Design a protein around this ligand. Structure first.
Ligand code: ANP
Ligand code: SF4
Length: 901
């Protein structure tokens, strides 16, 4: 307190625990030294914390000037910006590792670097250049010149470090023949402070406070600017906590100021944090005595039961205890499953490429129409099913039946000719969704960053997405089209190149990882997923170049020149700091969750000493979770004679205000049939001989598969293309099947010409059948429509398409199956005996199998048969259809709604 005064000098160090008044004491000394705007320099260490401390000072200060609030990287650029009295910075690592892919492919083509010849197949891989980039990016943070990395390649017998140092030296000579990376920005500025030797004295004479902040995360190359700027003038405060590694604080000759009172954390949270610091290689601080807090550890028995009790405890707190959303958080060790099972209880919770999302990709299809000049068929259907002018799949089927009234032509060709000029056919409501697509393609074709805005103006849906903000998808799409207008501007400053480049490119529960959870406050913190393979991280840190072994020989004597512990797993004592500092955010209470069928980590057995069987079916406060259970203890045979009264007493309070599922009108077991009528009632039923086999077999399959339920093929229309050719010279028919075959929906075009071969020969099999049996038979006609009245008084009235007559009359029915029906199974064949009974009365049978020509016969039992047609056709009358189990109870369409299974 006596060391922070306007009359004072030197370096003061300010260290304290997690939560204490550190960063709000640098703001308290920024203002107290002003009451000069300049020399009040901060180094906040984040781009978002720079504005958090700027607005804190400038509100506490009649207009004012600005204290200089910056970061370390943004300050080392301003030194380089002034030392050129412009120093440019290179792009993000796409353009910086696009240089790495060139120098490796430019080395494998040759035979100077000298890779150790085992790594020769590795050099073309994308996974080698994203590891070579890290051996340079982790020496750049530690100030190691490539002429000094090669000294390590000789003292130890490691050939791939001499090869890596010669890469990092040859890399820095084509980047200067400047161009600075991201991490190379502090190290390049520090060479320019000691170069001029008057640039120092014209910098130190400016600054007066140097309120550097968050000193613990500072690199040993960024820890030397703070030692250079604070060489001599005024007074400097360092601050931060020294025992959270994850200027220097631990070793200094400068006087320190400790802080032990927390101001945030409860005293029961402050004993679990400092209780874990006992088995850890200023660890004593106390909690806020005004608060009272709870720490508890819960276990689950599965993965889905974890997300069901997290969404329990997040729902108990807001809805009963009253703490709002956005004072809650869910911290996970690392993000790839939990946000889906936590939204399903009704909790507000706050990747995919840019040109792939449907609100953005529907507008890039307007540009491909515009760039070519004519719109195709496959990209004119893709505008109707998209967001611009939208149609559900049953209104494509209403366009086609209205456009084809203007063989039928294909829908891909009729659509384009309705956008080019609008026909006056439909005009009801489909005229509007076609005028919307003429308004876009006339605006963009009459006009590259000025056309793409003019398309967004014509397809007027910035108005429709603001009024409807289903209200989340408008805020997901508007937060995605504004990433086109940002990326499309970035290519214009440097329209077939627009499409070519983009193609390659509140009050909620914050779910975030541990490294993102070092800025929030959050009254309630859940640490989900502390278990065996996940939190004590046993993914081994080995690699090819030995990056994790270089980084702990070069940065300290953590390992000697022995590769024994170089590639094991993340260190456990340095992994305990993450769970010790994630609990350091909650100011009221902490819940720690892990599943155990997936085995809990040993950190869950250590918290249970300081906390205040696993669940397998947990309780929820979801409204669809109440009314499910309340209906299950009232519709019960066999417990709870007293609780049954309490069950139905609470459903009457749910049903009076809404809550769907509550009232006994809403229950799916309580609904009643619509009609239960006697069908036709009143009459002559009508039948065809191809349903009579089916009707007798099972009369429920007649009702559901003939009327509605029929799931759609390519094998049944070829079977009718054979019947058309056969009914019309055996070489004049092969030429007829050959032309028409090329338009059939066959994938695998090796199979279309392989299925033609068995259907070409099946016409030669038929003419090889005719000449054999034209001595015993004689054709009367072919494809006679049979119609008449049979079993007249109900009458059954057989109608339809006898295939081929012959005469010794007889009845020939041609089939194209491969496997024939047996000999004694065709004596009761219901199709032939309906034609045979047609031949007799008013106005033997053959069953020729073209394919694999084994024919079957039926002998010329009429009273036993004619009573069966009248007995079966009477069962197509009433309700309550019978579901017999037949041979066809497999590859039948209606089976998921059968009551016999
Ligand atoms: N004198 C005070 N009176 C009331 N509240 C205070 C006082 N001093 C600090 N606080 C509050 O205590 C909390 C501690 O925040 P602060 O001390 O600024 O964080 P920090 O410890 O510097 N940063 P970090 O450890 O990374 O979370 C904040 O909500 C402050 O507003
Ligand atoms: S599964 Fe059996 S009862 Fe059901 S429709 Fe098919 S044949 Fe008829």
């Amino acid at each position: 307190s006596t060391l922070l005064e306007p009359g004072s000098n030197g370096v003061v160090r300010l260290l304290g625990g997690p939560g204490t008044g550190k960063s709000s004491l640098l703001v308290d000394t920024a203002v107290q030294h002003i009451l000069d705007p300049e020399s009040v320099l901060l180094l906040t260490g984040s781009a978002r914390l720079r504005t958090a401390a700027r607005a804190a000072i400038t509100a506490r200060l009649g207009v004012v000037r600005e204290p200089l609030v910056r970061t370390v990287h943004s300050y080392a650029f301003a030194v380089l910006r002034l030392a050129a009295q412009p120093p440019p910075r290179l792009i993000t690592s796409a353009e910086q590792d696009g240089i790495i892919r060139e120098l490796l492919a430019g080395d494998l083509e040759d035979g100077p670097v000298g890779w150790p010849e085992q790594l020769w197949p590795a050099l073309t891989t994308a996974g080698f250049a994203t590891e070579l980039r890290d051996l340079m990016a982790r020496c750049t943070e530690r100030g190691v010149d490539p002429i000094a990395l090669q000294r390590l390649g000789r003292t130890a017998k490691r050939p791939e470090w001499l090869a890596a140092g010669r890469f990092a030296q040859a890399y820095e000579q084509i980047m200067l023949l400047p161009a600075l990376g991201a991490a190379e920005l502090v190290g390049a500025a520090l060479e320019a402070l000691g170069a001029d030797d008057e640039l120092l004295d014209t910098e130190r004479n400016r600054i007066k406070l140097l309120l550097v902040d968050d000193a613990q995360h500072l690199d040993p190359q960024a820890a030397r600017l703070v030692r250079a700027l604070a060489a001599g003038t005024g007074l400097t405060v360092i601050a931060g906590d020294p025992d959270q590694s994850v200027v220097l604080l631990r070793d200094d000759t400068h006087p320190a100021i400790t802080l032990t009172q927390s101001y945030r954390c409860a005293p029961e949270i402050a004993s679990a944090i400092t209780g874990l610091g006992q088995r850890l290689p200023t660890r004593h601080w106390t909690g806020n005595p005004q608060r009272e807090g709870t720490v508890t550890v819960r276990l689950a028995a599965s993965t889905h039961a974890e997300g069901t009790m997290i969404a329990d405890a997040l729902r108990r707190a807001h809805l009963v205890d009253g703490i709002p959303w956005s004072q809650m958080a869910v911290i996970v060790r690392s993000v790839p499953a939990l946000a889906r099972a936590l939204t399903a209880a009704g909790v507000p919770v706050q990747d995919v490429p840019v040109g792939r999302q449907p609100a953005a990709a529907a507008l890039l299809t307007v540009l491909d129409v515009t760039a070519t000049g004519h719109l195709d068929a496959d990209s004119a259907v893709a505008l109707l099913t998209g967001p611009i002018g939208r149609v559900d799949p049953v209104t494509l089927r209403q366009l086609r039946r209205a456009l084809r009234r203007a063989p039928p032509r294909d829908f891909g060709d009729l659509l384009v000719d309705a956008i080019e000029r609008e026909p006056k056919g439909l005009s009801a409501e489909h005229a509007r969704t076609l005028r919307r697509l003429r308004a876009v393609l006339t605006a963009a074709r009459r006009s590259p960053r000025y056309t793409l805005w003019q398309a967004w103006h014509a397809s007027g849906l910035q108005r429709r997405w603001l009024a409807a903000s289903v209200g989340a998808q408008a805020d997901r799409d508007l937060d995605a089209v504004t990433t086109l207008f940002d990326v499309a501007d970035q290519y214009v400053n440097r329209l077939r190149g627009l499409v070519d480049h983009v193609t390659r490119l509140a009050e909620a529960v914050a779910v975030l990882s541990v490294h993102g959870a070092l800025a929030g406050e959050w009254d309630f913190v859940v640490i989900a997923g502390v278990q065996e393979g996940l939190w004590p991280n046993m993914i081994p840190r080995g690699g090819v170049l030995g990056t994790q072994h270089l980084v702990d020989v070069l940065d300290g004597v953590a390992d000697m020149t022995d590769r024994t512990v170089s590639t094991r797993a993340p260190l456990v004592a340095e992994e305990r700091r993450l769970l010790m500092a994630a609990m350091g955010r909650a100011r009221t209470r902490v819940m720690i969750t892990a599943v155990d069928s997936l085995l809990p980590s040993p950190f869950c057995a250590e918290i249970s000493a300081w906390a205040t069987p696993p669940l397998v079916a947990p309780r929820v406060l979801a409204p669809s979770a109440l009314v499910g259970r309340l209906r299950a203890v009232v519709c019960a045979p066999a417990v709870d004679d007293d609780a049954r009264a309490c069950a139905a007493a609470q459903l009457a309070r749910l049903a009076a205000a809404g809550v769907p599922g509550a009232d006994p009108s809403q229950w799916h077991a309580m609904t009643s049939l619509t009609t239960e009528e006697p069908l036709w009632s009143e009459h002559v039923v009508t039948l065809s001989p191809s349903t009579l086999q089916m009707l007798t077999d099972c009369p429920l399959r007649w009702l559901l598969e003939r009327h509605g339920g029929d799931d759609g093929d390519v094998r049944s229309t070829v079977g009718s293309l054979v019947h058309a050719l056969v009914s019309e010279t055996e070489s004049q028919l092969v030429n007829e099947l050959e032309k028409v075959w090329d338009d059939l929906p066959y994938d695998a075009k090796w199979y279309s010409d392989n299925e033609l071969a068995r259907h070409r020969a099946m016409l030669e099999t038929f003419t090889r059948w005719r000449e054999d049996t034209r001595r015993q038979l004689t054709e009367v006609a072919t494809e006679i429509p049979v119609e008449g009245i049979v079993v007249e008084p109900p009458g059954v009235r057989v109608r339809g398409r006898l295939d081929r007559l012959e005469r010794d009359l007889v009845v020939v029915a041609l089939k194209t199956g491969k496997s024939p029906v047996t000999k004694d199974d065709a004596q009761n064949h219901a199709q032939l005996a309906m034609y045979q009974l047609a031949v007799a009365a008013g106005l033997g049978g053959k069953l020729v199998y073209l394919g694999k020509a084994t024919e079957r016969e039926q002998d010329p039992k009429r009273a036993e048969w004619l009573e069966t047609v009248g007995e079966a056709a009477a069962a197509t009358a009433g309700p309550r259809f019978v579901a017999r189990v037949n041979n066809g109870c497999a590859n039948c369409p209606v089976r998921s709604s059968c009551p016999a299974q």
